[PDB]
Design an enzyme around this catalytic site. Structure first.
Site, PDB file in Angstrom:
ATOM      1  N   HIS A  41      -2.172  -2.990 110.652  1.00  0.00           N
ATOM      2  CA  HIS A  41      -2.171  -2.319 111.566  1.00  0.00           C
ATOM      3  C   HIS A  41      -1.798  -2.538 112.496  1.00  0.00           C
ATOM      4  O   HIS A  41      -0.942  -1.883 113.435  1.00  0.00           O
ATOM      5  CB  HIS A  41      -3.333  -1.471 111.887  1.00  0.00           C
ATOM      6  CG  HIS A  41      -3.650  -0.245 112.200  1.00  0.00           C
ATOM      7  ND1 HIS A  41      -3.202   0.964 112.205  1.00  0.00           N
ATOM      8  CD2 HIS A  41      -3.677   0.347 113.790  1.00  0.00           C
ATOM      9  CE1 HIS A  41      -2.932   1.890 113.139  1.00  0.00           C
ATOM     10  NE2 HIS A  41      -2.900   1.287 113.833  1.00  0.00           N
ATOM     11  N   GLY A 146      -7.556  -2.242 120.669  1.00  0.00           N
ATOM     12  CA  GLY A 146      -7.538  -3.048 121.271  1.00  0.00           C
ATOM     13  C   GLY A 146      -7.832  -4.433 121.263  1.00  0.00           C
ATOM     14  O   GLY A 146      -7.647  -5.403 121.423  1.00  0.00           O
ATOM     15  N   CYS A 148      -8.574  -5.369 117.948  1.00  0.00           N
ATOM     16  CA  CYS A 148      -8.100  -5.284 116.218  1.00  0.00           C
ATOM     17  C   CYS A 148      -7.176  -6.960 116.463  1.00  0.00           C
ATOM     18  O   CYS A 148      -6.764  -7.556 117.331  1.00  0.00           O
ATOM     19  CB  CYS A 148      -7.375  -4.958 115.717  1.00  0.00           C
ATOM     20  SG  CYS A 148      -8.815  -3.143 114.859  1.00  0.00           S
TER      21      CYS A 148
HETATM   22  C1  LIG Z   1      -2.577  -0.494 118.205  1.00  0.00           C
HETATM   23  C2  LIG Z   1      -4.011   0.179 118.382  1.00  0.00           C
HETATM   24  O1  LIG Z   1      -4.869   0.563 117.767  1.00  0.00           O
HETATM   25  C3  LIG Z   1      -5.774  -0.335 117.361  1.00  0.00           C
HETATM   26  O2  LIG Z   1      -6.811  -0.312 118.569  1.00  0.00           O
HETATM   27  C4  LIG Z   1      -6.525  -1.132 116.518  1.00  0.00           C
HETATM   28  C5  LIG Z   1      -7.728  -0.543 117.229  1.00  0.00           C
HETATM   29  C6  LIG Z   1      -8.870  -0.510 116.164  1.00  0.00           C
HETATM   30  C7  LIG Z   1     -10.138  -0.664 116.488  1.00  0.00           C
HETATM   31  C8  LIG Z   1     -11.098   0.228 116.781  1.00  0.00           C
HETATM   32  C9  LIG Z   1     -11.200   1.299 117.591  1.00  0.00           C
HETATM   33  C10 LIG Z   1     -11.899   2.048 117.419  1.00  0.00           C
HETATM   34  N1  LIG Z   1     -12.994   0.975 117.344  1.00  0.00           N
HETATM   35  C11 LIG Z   1     -13.072  -0.052 116.964  1.00  0.00           C
HETATM   36  O3  LIG Z   1     -13.189  -0.981 116.475  1.00  0.00           O
HETATM   37  N2  LIG Z   1      -8.711  -0.014 115.112  1.00  0.00           N
HETATM   38  C12 LIG Z   1      -8.486   1.061 114.351  1.00  0.00           C
HETATM   39  O4  LIG Z   1      -8.082   2.329 115.480  1.00  0.00           O
HETATM   40  C13 LIG Z   1      -8.145   1.083 113.022  1.00  0.00           C
HETATM   41  C14 LIG Z   1      -8.449   2.744 112.633  1.00  0.00           C
HETATM   42  C15 LIG Z   1     -10.537   3.085 112.410  1.00  0.00           C
HETATM   43  O5  LIG Z   1     -11.061   2.078 112.823  1.00  0.00           O
HETATM   44  C16 LIG Z   1     -10.977   4.194 112.393  1.00  0.00           C
HETATM   45  N3  LIG Z   1     -12.262   3.891 111.349  1.00  0.00           N
HETATM   46  C17 LIG Z   1     -12.549   4.164 110.279  1.00  0.00           C
HETATM   47  O6  LIG Z   1     -11.959   5.066 110.095  1.00  0.00           O
HETATM   48  C18 LIG Z   1     -14.302   3.922 110.376  1.00  0.00           C
HETATM   49  C19 LIG Z   1     -14.653   3.817 109.324  1.00  0.00           C
HETATM   50  C20 LIG Z   1     -16.372   3.669 108.965  1.00  0.00           C
HETATM   51  C21 LIG Z   1     -17.290   3.211 108.108  1.00  0.00           C
HETATM   52  O7  LIG Z   1     -15.390   3.369 110.851  1.00  0.00           O
HETATM   53  N4  LIG Z   1     -14.865   2.880 111.240  1.00  0.00           N
HETATM   54  C22 LIG Z   1     -11.270   4.768 113.601  1.00  0.00           C
HETATM   55  C23 LIG Z   1     -10.071   5.332 114.563  1.00  0.00           C
HETATM   56  C24 LIG Z   1     -11.541   6.078 113.482  1.00  0.00           C
HETATM   57  C25 LIG Z   1      -7.080   1.269 112.567  1.00  0.00           C
HETATM   58  C26 LIG Z   1      -6.384   0.718 110.568  1.00  0.00           C
HETATM   59  C27 LIG Z   1      -6.075   1.159 110.231  1.00  0.00           C
HETATM   60  C28 LIG Z   1      -6.049   2.028 109.115  1.00  0.00           C
HETATM   61  C29 LIG Z   1      -6.755   0.291 107.992  1.00  0.00           C
HETATM   62  F1  LIG Z   1      -6.735   0.373 106.969  1.00  0.00           F
HETATM   63  C30 LIG Z   1      -7.088  -0.739 108.998  1.00  0.00           C
HETATM   64  C31 LIG Z   1      -7.313  -0.253 110.193  1.00  0.00           C
END
Ligand SMILES: CCOC(=O)CC[C@H](C[C@@H]1CCNC1=O)NC(=O)[C@@H](CC(=O)[C@@H](NC(=O)c1cc(C)on1)C(C)C)Cc1ccc(F)cc1
Length: 182
Positions: A41, A146, A148
């Site tokens: 991502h 933030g 990840c």
């Molecule tokens: C550049 C800024 O983006 C970031 O901050 C990366 C940080 C966040 C951390 C999340 C942020 C929130 N709570 C967390 O821990 N990660 C993501 O957002 C991911 C999406 C989710 O977590 C989604 N969760 C699910 O699908 C999900 C499924 C189950 C089960 O539990 N969650 C949510 C956005 C909805 C981004 C992603 C998309 C496609 C993929 F191949 C792999 C990853």
């Protein structure tokens, strides 16, 4: 708890870097040589910010396991001056769950942060914003945007990389040593 925390701290200076791509801020684990791992991502380009320096990227290769499944991590090689301390031996040969793990975050916005996530348990198949993967593990901690790339650690192993969450739980891609073989 304490033991995973101190092991996690021993990884920080030498192996856990603050990075920024066009997608935002991420934690990056340097593994050996000029090889590091990021969440897919983060979408690294031709240059990437590492700490205060804009560093050229040699390549970025999506990590796909031996069963042909995208793990949603990319292996990035870097035009860095120095090699990373080789932490291959701390990546377990088998994907591993663990009790009382520590999640290490290190970004500009969340610097040098140790998160007690509790028990890390098998989860398996995960559909992350419509992208399916497997071999994931879960912790009942409200992880956030933030975090990840954050490094999930046990008493003495690096067991996963944080990739997603739903507001109340967090999920990591599991690591095993063969993923980093040359
Ligand atoms: C550049 C800024 O983006 C970031 O901050 C990366 C940080 C966040 C951390 C999340 C942020 C929130 N709570 C967390 O821990 N990660 C993501 O957002 C991911 C999406 C989710 O977590 C989604 N969760 C699910 O699908 C999900 C499924 C189950 C089960 O539990 N969650 C949510 C956005 C909805 C981004 C992603 C998309 C496609 C993929 F191949 C792999 C990853």
């Amino acid at each position: 708890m304490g033991p995973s925390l101190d092991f996690a701290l021993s990884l920080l200076r030498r192996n856990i870097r603050q990075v920024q791509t066009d997608q935002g801020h991420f934690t990056m684990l340097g593994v050996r040589d000029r090889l590091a791992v990021l969440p897919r991502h983060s979408q690294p380009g031709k240059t990437i910010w590492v700490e205060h320096k804009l560093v050229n990227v040699l390549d970025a290769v999506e990590l796909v396991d031996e069963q042909g499944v995208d793990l949603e991590l990319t292996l990035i090689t870097l035009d860095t001056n120095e090699k990373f301390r080789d932490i291959t031996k701390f990546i377990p040969e088998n994907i591993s769950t663990a009790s009382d793990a520590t999640l290490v975050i290190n970004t500009e916005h969340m610097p040098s942060m140790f998160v007690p996530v509790g028990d890390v348990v098998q989860y398996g198949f995960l559909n992350l914003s419509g992208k399916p993967t497997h071999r994931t593990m879960m912790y009942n901690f409200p992880t956030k945007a933030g975090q990840c790339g954050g490094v999930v650690t046990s008493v003495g192993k690096v067991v996963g990389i944080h990739i997603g969450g739903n507001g109340r739980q967090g999920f990591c891609a599991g690591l095993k040593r063969s993923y980093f073989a040359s």
